[PDB]
């Protein structure tokens, strides 16, 4: 393959600067790797890669990738080739990938329209294929730079995988039958739709509200309220799926029941020992919904409740009454309330200052290994 | 087994108060549940379990497990039994187990005696099976006592199981040649020994120094000073093991490798995505020792300089001047020069307010999957 070669490149060079993270704003070391890529076979060749060595060459002039990320908002292959440096995805240094786009609903992308491409990966280089990966944001360069029309690309087919490895197993284990008919069975050309609604949905209410990031991104990041975040967007995903007529009904279902199983089960025991942010977010709506009916656990298995819709709005209409304060209150003040909506739901250890994954979902981590 | 058919019928009572640990102080279910361990054919007949269904029928008078913490702190048999509720083992509910002894050193057990058991696993019911279990303490039963002369145990077989699947590996993959000679190849019952000295001098270091625990446990909960105080112990462990002149040599060199081994790499990489608070405590002593001539990064792979034994005494001395101010300012100021040492030398996300795997220890997990 001409692109498997062009990868064994990439991933040649990667492993020469592996060592020169700190290096990777010097000019000195730019200039010796912008030439390494431009003397590169099948690489240098590259429009994408022509791109990359001009803006690395020019980088003490301008730090910004205006050439790649030109290329790459532009859509003019579907190569992505850049020098990254993102502190939670640290498996990224030089990188390339191609891809492939998704079929997308026109009412949905018209609706909730926003920069971002559910794609599969065709090929990867190392860094890439690293099962945190499952995004690229525009600030994930190394330049740091995100501009709100940016192409925010998210990895389809790991979330197809981690639904088939992860997901499929605990409806098994934790839902009552029938809880989720329409994903009982489906291939992943189904999951695969289901996700790339979920991803668009997602980024779009991720700028709706009146907290929106990236504008208050620094008050989101506490550990419950980043995943407090996602779950504020995927809940409206949710709600969307339910509620808009102008989306096809069997299409809207399936990435209904996608979102609620993602968030209910599959987000709801990650992190060992204790839960990461999607987690305690998870592990908040499993408790709001147990309290309010919108679920019940007979003997440990869930029974989603008829009047789960209207548990989920009442829910999303709670987060949206602490975070309309801000417009009297400081965002400050708001995160408090954020925080303690979030940890009467939490099993949240006040000395250490941290969470515990709640008793439900710890057995079933034991259970079966998730 | 007389012991098999005794947790047989632990496990099947275990199994029915699944869920009912809302219950596990209410003396309705508690009498009904001494009711069945009394009437257990095997299980109702064993001295300690005598004693439970004794202690949990008086439990709405006396809300402890005397006749069961007495008959375990008096050694009667290897037997233990009890109704515990420890939130970081929420895997034990009620559980049984039968114990081996370890040979042990009299200077080691005279000179730094604690009431520490390192003891082997040999029979247990399913909640003590967990990995996450890895010792007993007093305050794990249901009352919640803990006594400066209560016996505490440490399951030295799951020590051994998690040295041959994690610590040996990174020795192979991360250690210069070498480094950890008497540790190359060890049996088990080699590896068991230098576990038991390392527990014995965990649990007696905890009670030395200017802010023990017990008495200050409270301060020292929060993520990286929990981490930080097993780190104070362990390296006070390690230099015992080397200035003692009264520790039998190979014993105590053995000793001195395997804790180093386990603090420089098993504990460095817990914890996905983020640090536990082992592993923090291990990144902070991973970027001391570097920056202060202890060991060294050649090609990759950790060299241990000659003179690492000065840089640990330093690095503990360190400890022990930031703790020693307890006699002069408050435990919040200790707290805050504790937690202003670590972030020196760990990667702490202030917006977060969390840590990072540092990046020589992500690459490690990535690569071998730890
Ligand atoms: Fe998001
Ligand atoms: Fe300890």
């Known amino acids: 393959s001409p692109t498997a070669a062009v990868i064994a490149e990439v991933d040649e060079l990667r492993e020469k600067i592996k060592g020169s993270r700190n290096s990777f704003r010097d000019q000195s070391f730019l200039d010796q790797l912008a030439q390494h890529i431009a003397d590169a076979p099948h690489l240098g060749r590259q429009p994408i890669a022509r791109a990359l060595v001009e803006d690395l060459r020019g980088y003490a002039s301008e730090p910004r990738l205006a050439a790649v990320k030109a290329h790459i908002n532009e ?12 502190s939670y995805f640290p498996s990224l240094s030089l990188e390339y990938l191609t891809y492939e786009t998704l079929p997308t609903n026109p009412h949905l992308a018209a609706r909730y329209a926003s920069p971002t491409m559910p794609v599969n990966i065709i090929a990867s280089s190392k860094g890439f294929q690293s099962r945190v990966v499952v995004a690229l944001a525009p600030e994930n360069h190394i330049d740091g730079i995100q501009r709100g029309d940016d192409l925010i690309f998210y990895f389809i087919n790991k979330f197809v995988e981690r639904h088939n490895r992860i997901t499929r197993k605990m409806i098994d284990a934790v839902m009552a039958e029938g809880s989720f008919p329409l994903l009982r069975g489906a291939d992943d050309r189904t999951v695969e739709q289901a996700s790339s609604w979920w991803v668009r949905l997602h980024e779009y209410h991720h700028r709706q509200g009146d907290m929106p990031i990236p504008e208050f991104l620094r008050y ?56 990461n942010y ?85 057995e079933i981590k034991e259970r079966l290994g998730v």
């Not at 859509?75 to 993102?86: C, M, P, V, Y």
């Not at 993602?262 to 020992?273: K, T």
């Not at 440990?300 to 417009?327: K, M, N, S, W, Y």
């Open 75 to 86: 859509e003019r292959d579907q190569h992505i080739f850049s020098l990254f440096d993102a």
């Open 220 to 275: 989101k990041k506490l550990k419950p309220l980043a995943g407090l975040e996602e779950l504020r967007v995927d809940v409206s995903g949710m709600l969307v799926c339910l509620n808009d007529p102008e989306l096809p009904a069997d299409e809207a279902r399936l990435a209904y029941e996608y979102i609620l199983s993602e968030r209910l089960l599959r987000y709801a025991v990650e992190g060992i020992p204790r839960p």
């Open 278 to 362: 999607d987690a305690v977010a998870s592990q908040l709506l499993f408790n709001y919904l147990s309290e309010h009916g919108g679920i019940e656990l007979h003997g440990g298995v869930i029974r989603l409740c008829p009047e789960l819709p209207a548990v989920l709005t009442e829910f999303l209409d709670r987060i949206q009454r602490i975070e309309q304060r801000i417009h009297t209150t400081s965002a400050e003040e708001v995160q408090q309330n954020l925080l303690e909506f979030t940890n009467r739901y939490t099993d949240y250890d006040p000395d250490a200052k941290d969470y515990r994954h709640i008793p439900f979902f710890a």
